[PDB]
């Protein structure tokens, strides 16, 4: 009878405990292992995968592939915004249901850079140039191309490359940000503008579409595991 | 820089989760409960697992059994401490037909006896599959005739789990509720797949009612 003193926390069932338990199937000969393709070891391996972004959340498009189509057209203007959404990877609807956003919604904190890949799906004969700009917070969302120009931006010529990657950097006062919307962890606004109007030849369509993809960079991590708000239950499914 | 430790699959899945909970009462002879073991009744853990096509892991089972006094027409009820028995019947074994069946001897079947007021009983179990990994989905049928059953319910054959009170309290009825908790240990995952978008409809199939791609805003320029 070794003398012992119980400390508080005994007879306690902590969901996230890591104690040993006695097996109910002693000496159970497990079936050997098989080299199955596609081993996942971390959820960031999934978060790093490009997945199409529904930039056009319009009620009418959300129940269709039109959500993923970003409209661009040959216009008689200059410096016309193509799109703009805030940098809420886990909160705003534009990205919350992406692969990255889905994984973010299982955690509370996140930090890192984000790859926005833009692919032009117009005719091979079309040309043009766009300004993809990430404006950190503090000042309102850029209203003009001039206002967008003062922040981190990239000019994408659709003349040669069909795809262009804008890699939004991690510019934050803190090391991490809340996956849920908080103004203290505000993150910025991502806007797109016409740099040079879509020029098209004769007998070619002047209105084309663009696809946006989101992924995480090598410097992306999430923290404080939690349950997703996306799944809901009321009765045991049968 | 920082680390991605908390995003490993082991930490992602290795958290206890209620998979199912049922009730049984002391009165009657049907006062035992039974549950065919599936992982698709509960949305949260089901989705966590369904992030992958194939999984492989051991399990930590934690049982939370809570009882409550039920109405009685007696003068004064004073129930003694209550003990419970949890029996696992692998597919094909004898099945309890009544609260006092011979099956409850569990000569071979593993079973747990737990008295109320102590630490919840806990029990680890190995990788119990016939294949080299658990299958989360199955794009096939159970019959070689390409007919009959379609889905993961052609693979699920993990046996049943029965529950009873051991003492035969008579002076007053008592209803108990057992909650099953799964905690995947030593996890290996393969072939990730898109997270569940549409809400679950049935435990034995993927059937869904179409839902929108994402929440909506006014315009593409609307921040």
């Amino acid at each position: 009878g070794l003398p012992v003193m119980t400390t508080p926390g005994s007879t306690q069932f902590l969901t996230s405990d890591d104690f040993q338990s006695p097996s109910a199937m002693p000496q159970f000969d497990v079936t050997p292992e098989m080299q199955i393709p596609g081993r996942v070891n971390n959820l960031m391996e999934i978060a790093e995968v490009d997945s199409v972004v529904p930039v056009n959340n319009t009620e009418a498009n959300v129940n269709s592939l039109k959500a993923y189509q970003i409209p661009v057209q040959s216009n008689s203007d200059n410096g016309k915004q193509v799109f703009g959404f805030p940098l809420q990877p886990g909160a705003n609807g534009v990205l919350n249901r992406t692969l990255l956003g889905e994984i973010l919604n299982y955690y509370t904190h996140w930090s890192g850079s984000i790859k926005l890949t833009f692919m032009f799906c117009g005719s091979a004969m079309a040309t043009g140039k766009f300004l993809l700009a990430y404006s950190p917070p503090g000042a309102g969302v850029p209203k003009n191309r001039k206002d967008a120009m003062l922040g981190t931006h990239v000019i994408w010529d659709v003349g040669l490359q069909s795809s262009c990657v804008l890699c939004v950097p991690w510019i934050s006062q803190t090391h991490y940000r809340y996956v849920v919307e908080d103004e203290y962890t505000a993150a910025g606004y991502i806007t797109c503008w016409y740099q040079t109007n879509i020029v098209v030849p004769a007998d070619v369509q002047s209105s084309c579409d663009i696809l946006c993809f989101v992924s995480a960079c090598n410097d992306f991590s999430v923290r404080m595991l939690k349950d997703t708000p996306f799944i809901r239950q009321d009765t045991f499914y049968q | 820089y920082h680390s991605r430790s908390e995003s490993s699959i082991e930490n992602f899945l290795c958290r206890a989760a209620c998979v199912y909970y049922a009730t049984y009462t002391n009165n009657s002879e049907k006062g035992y409960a039974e549950w065919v073991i599936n992982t698709r009744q509960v949305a949260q853990l089901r989705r966590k697992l369904e992030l992958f096509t194939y999984l492989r892991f051991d399990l930590e089972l934690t049982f939370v059994i809570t009882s409550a006094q039920q109405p009685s027409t007696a003068t004064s009820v004073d129930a003694p401490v209550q003990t419970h028995q949890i029996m696992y019947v692998p597919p094909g074994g004898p099945v309890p037909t009544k609260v006092t069946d011979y099956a409850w001897q569990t000569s071979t079947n593993p079973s747990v006896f737990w008295t109320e007021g102590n630490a919840p009983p806990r029990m680890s179990i190995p990788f119990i599959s016939i294949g080299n990994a658990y299958s989360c989905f199955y794009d096939g049928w159970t019959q070689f005739s390409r007919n009959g059953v379609y889905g993961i319910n052609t693979l699920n054959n993990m046996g049943t789990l029965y529950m009873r009170h051991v003492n035969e309290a008579g002076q007053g009825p008592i209803k108990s509720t057992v909650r099953i908790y799964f905690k995947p240990k030593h996890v290996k995952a393969w072939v990730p797949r898109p997270p569940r978008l549409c809400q679950y409809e049935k435990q034995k199939n993927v059937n869904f009612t179409p839902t929108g791609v994402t929440t909506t805003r006014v315009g593409i320029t609307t921040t």
Partner: peptide
């Protein structure tokens, strides 16, 4: 420091460290 008490590997803690 961490040593295992049970004869079956399934009884072991999570593969965290």
């Amino acid at each position: 420091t961490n040593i295992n008490y049970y004869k079956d590997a399934a009884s072991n803690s999570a593969n965290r460290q």
